[PDB]
Amino acid sequence: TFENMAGVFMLVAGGIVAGIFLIFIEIAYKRHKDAR
Amino acid sequence: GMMGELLSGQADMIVAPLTINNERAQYIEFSKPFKYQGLTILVKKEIP
Amino acid sequence: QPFQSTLWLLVGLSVHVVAVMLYLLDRFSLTLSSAMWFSWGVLLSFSARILGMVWAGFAMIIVASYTANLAAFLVLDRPRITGINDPRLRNPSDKFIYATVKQSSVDIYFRRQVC
């Protein structure tokens, strides 16, 4: 509703979207590092 | 305007939201007032 | 704490009635003071999850009410006198006494001034 609330609402979606990809790539990076 | 039209004979009775002034009263008679109001300042809304 | 002293007992009653309900719930699937210890620890799992949620809500309500009361009282009380423009001077009762020294400029000013 408020400007701060709207900013938080817009930011959390982008944050979780970025975090999903970060976790997906970090799992692969950790697996590759463990394999080596 | 309206006072000139009344003085020229184009009109006889004035029924409009017209204020009361000394100059207007010196030439045009005014009846009892409808409501007691003043002048205020209008400012456009400002977003927070 | 003079901030609505009659309402402070309500908080105690609320934090006291929860203990017996918690003990009864525990007995219906930890005898004397375990429930009180757990309640005070969480104030500082189906039914248990709901109890934790309502305890958190109680704590949030209490802290929000305390902050709001403090903020309101800091400005509503313990923050005046303006002067002649104050209408109470034109109608002075016995609560406020206005006095000066006789045969001075203040008497002359009061006598000369209108209203």
Partner: protein
Amino acid sequence: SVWVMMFVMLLIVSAIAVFVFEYFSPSFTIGKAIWLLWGLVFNTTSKIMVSVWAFFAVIFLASYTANLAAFMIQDQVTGLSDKKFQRPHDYSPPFRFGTVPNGSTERNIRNNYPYMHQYMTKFNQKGVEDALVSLKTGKLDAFIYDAAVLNYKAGRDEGCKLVTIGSGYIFATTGYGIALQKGSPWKRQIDLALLQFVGDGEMEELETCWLTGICDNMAGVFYMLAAAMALSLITFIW
């Protein structure tokens, strides 16, 4: 729309970590997600992304509480169009209304509500100042008189307990002025002077000379307690 926003956000955050946990499985069922969600408020390398969100939510709730605290720092009859005036006998305490006799508002009331005399006669007084002491002692409920006198009485009242109804409700204004006998030619000389005095600011400066005057949490707690009791009883039943 904060309520719907949080309602749709909790559903998203109740699975944004469940999907990750399920992907890490090849840990138990949705109970872990519920425990983590309800322990996140107040007090595995994937927990940093939820810890930062928890800190942001703590900041948001602190800001909300501060805003509510800052907002928290800033009734009677609506007029003569209420059924209580028409039927004062509906309630056990009778309404005590009256005014001084041989006045001017009595005839105006008669021209509009001629049936009010039966109650006016039983509460007539012999002075305007008697109404104040009658109200203080409970002998009367309200005083019917000119608005200007009531404003002065409210302004000079001790303790400011007396106040006009509403935000200065005025009905049948018909403001008074200087009277003049029929056929007097001085009307055209006096009306212009009075209008000039009004428009030039003499009234405004002289107003201060004489016209001087001085100008829920319990429900929320009860509702929250009722909701908590309802939740407890429905949980016990289920």
